Structure of Alr2278 protein:
Amino acid sequence: MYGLVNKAIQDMISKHHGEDTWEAIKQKAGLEDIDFFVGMEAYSDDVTYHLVGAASEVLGKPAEELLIAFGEYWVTYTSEEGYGELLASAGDSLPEFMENLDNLHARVGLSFPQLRPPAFECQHTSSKSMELHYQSTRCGLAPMVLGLLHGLGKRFQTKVEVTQTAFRETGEDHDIFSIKYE
Ligand code: HEM
């Protein structure tokens, strides 16, 4: 995954738990020979998994919980790190932003060539609900989507409820989320 993801995890932990805790995690992740993450450079996915795994152990929180927090953090973090305009061009409401999600990831995809973005499809079921279909080349990142959706809720002063209804882990084709919103 691109450096920006690892920078954000790093930033999230440093800001909440301090520089020492970050170093402890860094060490345990097996990444002490890396002084900084380069935001526009592609890293092996392993870097991210090892980071999250290491932080799970050092912080005493399950990985899935950290992925949720990371998901929430990302919406705010990107607006401050080069993507404020891009975010604003994706919409004025949550359902609109969700429709534009592939588009948004493609507009990053011009900048970042070796991107492997997820694919999202919205089936609207009412003016206050939708089904969100999530397909990915990667495993175990559905909890991250849950945090992203709450981030977006916060962004749009919109109350939101997200419940996963289908899991790859039980053998379903792809993850599906039921979403209700203000
Ligand atoms: C400007 C805002 C956003 C930017 C700049 C952005 C950019 C990125 C980038 C660079 C990656 C890594 C892809 C790779 O390295 O292959 C990624 C991954 C991902 N994105 Fe976003 N993204 C944004 C918003 C969102 C939102 C709102 C969602 C809501 C569901 C989302 C869902 C995901 C998921 C689930 C992944 C994990 C990769 C995977 O599933 O394969 N992104 N994003």
